[model samples]
Target: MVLYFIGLGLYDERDITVKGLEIAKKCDYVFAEFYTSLMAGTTLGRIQKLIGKEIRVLSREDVELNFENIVLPLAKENDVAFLTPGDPLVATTHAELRIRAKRAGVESYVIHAPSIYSAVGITGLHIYKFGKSATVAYPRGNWFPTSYYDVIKENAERGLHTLLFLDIKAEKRMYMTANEAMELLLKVEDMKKGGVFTDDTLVVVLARAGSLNPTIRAGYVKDLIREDFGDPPHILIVPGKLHIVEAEYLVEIAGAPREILRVNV
Candidate 1:
């Protein structure tokens, strides 16, 4: 008996690598959770149809809180497969689930797939320039998460690009657009007065990543703060010093303003 953690890739069923598909078919039981990130292109029915197995969908509470009670019990005797949007452990605490499976005396294996983490390559930015990434979380009734501003500042100071994932509430089928993230960044700047995020700040927005034809736009926050990026599941990037080639790619490819070709010195 073994537990398998399989990443469902980024956008849809076809994104799953052939190896993941082959092994997932052999899994006796399949389970998935979606709240961590967006799988905007496919549905559970379609994914199940592809794998030819019933996928029991779990919630944040179900997987993180009651995983042992509901999932581990089945894994004790059967080949269990756990699925997640993007790479299984990229942006979630689900990595601990593997450790918990070990404590439960269940063997676990990981199967990787094409993840949105690497999808940034399509934006024409050098992937190696990215530093620590952050999540743009929703400022809730009592919790106003704002460390992401500092992350951009820290990475910018080092001339490393910063990757930002928008806030999401998968249960409600809602996500914070890059517009919302930009607004939040400005608000946070007002609070901290860190000058990390402002109207003139340059940013890149990727909407519906993991698709072959995603919208890649780059500009100053003042101009792009209200730009529509097609639909939900948006991604934001804050670049540090330009590599010139990187700037040219953004100008010709991502449609960034020509002025960006001039490095700030």
Candidate 2:
């Protein structure tokens, strides 16, 4: 009897690795959670159809609060599987669950799949140049988060790209768009007066990543704030220093203006 933590990739059901699918098919029970990140390209029923198993999707509460009570108990005698969007440990909170499994004496294994962390390669930016990543959260009632703005400032100082993950409230179906993220940063600039993110700052917007034809647009914040990038699950990237070849790829493939290539000099 064992437990498996498998990642279902970034977009759809077919994105699951062959090994993960094969192992999941054999598991006696399968549990999944969607709140960490979502698969904008498919549905739960479709994923279940692909795996040939009825996956019990856990809520943030179920997994965070009482995983031992409901999910771990079953692993005592039968093989169980816990499926998550992207790489299982990419969501740091999900890693703690493994500790819970260990305490409960459940032997667990991991199955990695495609994750957005590495998929940023499609942006034409060198993977080695990516410095620190941060999430832009939606400000609510009494709280507003601005730490990510500093993340950009810090990475830029070292001439590294910053990958900004737009926040999501999956239970309420609220996904923060790249446009909204830019607007929020602009507002933070107004408050801090840091000149970190402003109208003139260059940014890249990648939407619906992992799809055959994902949207990739790059330009100044002033121009892109109102630009349309299709649908949810967007990613915002702020590049620090650009290589000539990288700038050429941006202009040629992602619709970055021809003028940016001149600025890199």
Candidate 3:
């Protein structure tokens, strides 16, 4: 028996890898985790119809509590595919699953696919130049986090890019927008006076990457705070310093205005 951890990638059904689809089709049982993340345009029904399989969806607790009893045992008898949005291993819980399966003497394989971990290219920054990545969360009754700023601060000083993922509640399909994310960072910068980021800091807002009609814009944090990024599944990239090629790419490819970019230069 085997457990196939499949990554559906970003966007929709077609993004699934050929091997992922093959494994998914032959599985005796299929499951998907929705709590980690979900695609904006992807739905369980659509994926079921496209992949020609109905997945037994697992909630946060179901997987956490019943994993060994329910999910793992099934993998002992027949092939089971545990699907996830984006790469499965990006969710540490799923990585644990792969390890657990190996421990149980079950053959396990991963079908890797595209993920936001590497999708920040919409900002025209070199992926290899990014240091650490962080995610912004909804305010907790006036409680804001500065840890991400610390990540940005570290990256900025080292001349490396930082990727900040927008907050998303997968079960509710709730997502924090790029503009809101920018405002949050600006607030933290104001409070800390850390100078890691400021009004003049270059911010690249990406909306719906890996999708048709994806939107990208680059500007100062203050200006981006007032700009509309249009939809969810948004991400913000803070660059330490732009290379000439990267600056040109931002303008020529992503519509970052050259006039405004000059001010940052």
Model 1 TM: 0.95
What is the lDDT ranking, best to worst? Answer: 2, 1, 3
- lDDT string for model 1 (195-226, tens) is 88898888999887878788999999999998
Candidate 3 displacement at residue 68 in angstroms:
1.4
lDDT of 2 by residue, 60-158 (tens): 999999899889999989999999999889998988888999999999999999999999899898899999899999899889989999999999888
Predicted structure with the largest lDDT when compared to the true one: 2
lDDT of 3 by residue, 12-56 (tens): 888789989988999999998888888776778999987888889
User: Which whole-number lDDT from 0 to 100 does residue 206 have in model 3?
Assistant: 80
Q: Rate the local accuracy (lDDT) of all candidates.
A: 0.88, 0.91, 0.83
User: For model 2, what is the C-alpha lDDT against the true structure?
Assistant: 0.91
Worst 10 residues of 2 by lDDT: 256-265
TM-score for candidate 3, residues paired by index: 0.95
**Model 1 misplacement above 4 A:** none
